[PDB]
């Protein structure tokens, strides 16, 4: 709490605590050599079901370049397939492991970031979080 | 409309705040991940890829591509490490301090002003009281 003592602007902590969320993600997906990053890519697929690395790259706001390399490695393990149009989607393996992924990880980062957060500071930060997306 | 979890919640803000960076930014043809490197040299100084890599959570290998650009752009210089030799420490070109010294200007006032326009002045000051709560 060097932190209530000095005024940090709101971009800077919304930084901050993603990278918080992403250091504990890491830390409970280790059990499947899957990175936050990797967890996210494949979430962004199962939700478009099928997407090109283009429409991805714009989805998820990162390098194509980058992607492509991402893209390498989750066909590689099973987790996605490349599919004649490029369009990425997973496979039916890499669909079971965004599925135990959430299921594995849930609950838990919840209670980890919410740990020094009173119930009703919960319900606060959800909610004015929320107020900034639209 | 429903109820999404915190860390979800994190996400979507921070990918709303990197997409507004990017667009900000685009003038610079400089995206928000490459200023978040300009801006993690300038308070290091001088720093390792393999440290800054370590402060950034990035592939190393990622890392050595984005420094590749910023270097061709002349944002970034490459040194002769005094403890390696065998290796190299970065830090900002003169060029380089002038946009990563303009980070306060854009997350502390126009970035901050598109994300905060839905909120009030003590919703602001509440949410941000918040996400320091959670940084413990």
Known sequence: SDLFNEIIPLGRLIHM???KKDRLLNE???PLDITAAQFKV???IRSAASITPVELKKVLSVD????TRMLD???SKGWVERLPNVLVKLTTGGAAISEQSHQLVGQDLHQELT???????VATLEYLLKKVLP
């Open 73 to 75: 490695r989750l066909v």
């Open 42 to 44: 494949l979430s962004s």
């Open 28 to 30: 409970y997906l280790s």
């Open 64 to 67: 194509l370049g980058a992607l």
């Open 115 to 121: 740990k020094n957060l009173t119930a009703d500071e």
């Open 17 to 19: 605590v993603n990278q």
